[PDB]
Amino acid sequence: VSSTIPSQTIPFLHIQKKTKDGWEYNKKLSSLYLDGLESAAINGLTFK
Amino acid sequence: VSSTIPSQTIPFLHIQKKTKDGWEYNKKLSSLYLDGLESAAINGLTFK
């Protein structure tokens, strides 16, 4: 679903990174989080 | 002294404005504050 994130739009759920200006949306971390969410939705998420 | 603020450099003392991204340096408000400080240094500042 990260590839399906549209260009220039910030997803509704997103991981922010810290920079000199402050916290800002990070495409890479948001990609990782959204892919994890997709895997949790399809295969499930384990907490053993 | 505001005119003597160098271009593209943020003064050591400066007023920030609020924007969608957060608090950021504002040339206009920093100009006003620095001019007030210059006047306080030269002529003095009153609190009557």
Q: Does A21 touch chain B (CB under 8 A)?
A: yes
Contact flag B24-A24 (C-beta cutoff 8 Å): no
Beta-strand runs (E) in B1-48: 16-19, 22-25
Residues of B in contact with A24 (CB under 8 A): 21
How many other CB atoms are there within 10 angstroms of residue B34's CB atom? 20
Per-residue DSSP letter, B38: H
With CA atoms as reference, the chain A residue closest to B25 would be: A21
Tokens of B21: 């991204």
Q: Does B21 touch chain A (CB under 8 A)?
A: yes
Cα dihedral across residues A20, A23, A27, A29: positive or negative: positive
Q: Which of B38, B37, B12, B36 is nearest to B25 (CA)?
A: B12
Which residue(s) pair with A24 in the sheet? A17
Indicate which technique resolved this structure. Answer: cryo-EM
Task: Give the resolution to one decimal, in Å.
Answer: 2.7
3-state SS class at B29: helix
Tokens of B9: 């450099």
Instruction: Give the C-alpha distances (Å, rounded to integers) separating A11 from A27, B4, B41.
Output: 9, 43, 50
